[PDB]
Amino acid sequence: RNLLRNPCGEEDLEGWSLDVNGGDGWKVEELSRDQRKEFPNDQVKKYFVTSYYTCRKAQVIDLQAEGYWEELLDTTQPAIVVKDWYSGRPDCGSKYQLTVRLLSENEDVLAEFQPDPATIQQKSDAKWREISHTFIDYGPGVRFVRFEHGGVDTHYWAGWYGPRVTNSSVWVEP
Amino acid sequence: RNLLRNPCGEEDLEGWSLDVNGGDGWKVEELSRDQRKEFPNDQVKKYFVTSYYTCRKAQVIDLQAEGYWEELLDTTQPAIVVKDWYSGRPDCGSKYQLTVRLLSENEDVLAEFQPDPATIQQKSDAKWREISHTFIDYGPGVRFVRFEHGGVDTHYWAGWYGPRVTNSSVWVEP
């Protein structure tokens, strides 16, 4: 049970918080039948593409609102697994970055998955990549999951397109 | 092919670099038959246990020395997969921290996986957990991989002991 709203763009841009570029920073497209082969299920049929290399978008999940009460979290600590799929485009290099945080009730960063940026080298095609992380043993107080991704916000145009993203998920393990 | 030597203590502490505590910081024990069922390959039979809550140990993998050549590293950037297993002990709190770096020829940190500390809550048992990370799209220039793990080096005793560790690996995906 994926706790992120609108993982692939089926509701267009709804459910996502946009950066300064707003609506103009993003487009939703259909995957070629070929690209559909690259995902676990055959339920991934769309994707988001940044219009400009710095574009990011974000969502915050309220765990209590999703059925995960205070005490299950503090006491049981179930695995929270976060995944994303990103790619470049056919013919040049993209940059991508993902930030996922586990937040307390007053928004302290209690845990953080912020891997280095991904540099997607240029190629005739644009294979999808997955990125995955599981939080366990994360401690008491976890209430929100903030999930943010897109291009690398930098003052410096150095060649690199923004990424394509789709199939974002967050879930709590049984 | 796992590029870490001695991932389980079959060779005692050989191949590992020890912290200030050297050898008194570590013991190798045999897993009970029940504890061996928690691992995939039936070939994990020992583990490492910290003698003090701060003890760490590390290895540095030279990737050219392992057959991974410059052009493969700089242009293909094949997935570098890193895994570790850790637990506590029955009835106390343990704390654990893993630090994995990709390094250039000069030891510049090109990519780093340093997840927040794991707080292993106290419990009747000591179930192993696995931690796993894949490095892809990490850019050119990677030559060494440093793998460090153990308890949390803090000056302050808070009751939290160090962990047990085993079956550590780093491999390069075909």
UniProtKB/Swiss-Prot annotation, chains A, B:
Intracellular or extracellular location(s): Cytoplasm; Microsome membrane
Traits of the deletion mutant: No visible phenotype at birth. Mice are viable and fertile, but after two to four months, gradual hearing loss sets in, due to degeneration of epithelial support cells and hair cells of the organ of Corti and spiral ganglion neurodegeneration.
Consequence when changing W157A: Abolishes binding of glycoprotein targets. Strongly reduced ubiquitination of glycoprotein targets
Organ and tissue specificity: Detected in brain and cochlea, in epithelial support cells and hair cells of the organ of Corti (at protein level).
Residues that hold a carbohydrate according to the record: R89, P90, D91, Y156, W157
Known role: Substrate recognition component of a SCF (SKP1-CUL1-F-box protein) E3 ubiquitin-protein ligase complex that mediates the ubiquitination and subsequent proteasomal degradation of target proteins. Involved in the endoplasmic reticulum-associated degradation pathway (ERAD) for misfolded lumenal proteins by recognizing and binding sugar chains on unfolded glycoproteins that are retrotranslocated into the cytosol and promoting their ubiquitination and subsequent degradation. Prevents formation of cytosolic aggregates of unfolded glycoproteins that have been retrotranslocated into the cytosol.
Protein name (record): F-box only protein 2
Species this protein is from: Mus musculus (Mouse)
UniProt gene name: Fbxo2
Whole sequence portion shown: 125 to 297 of 297
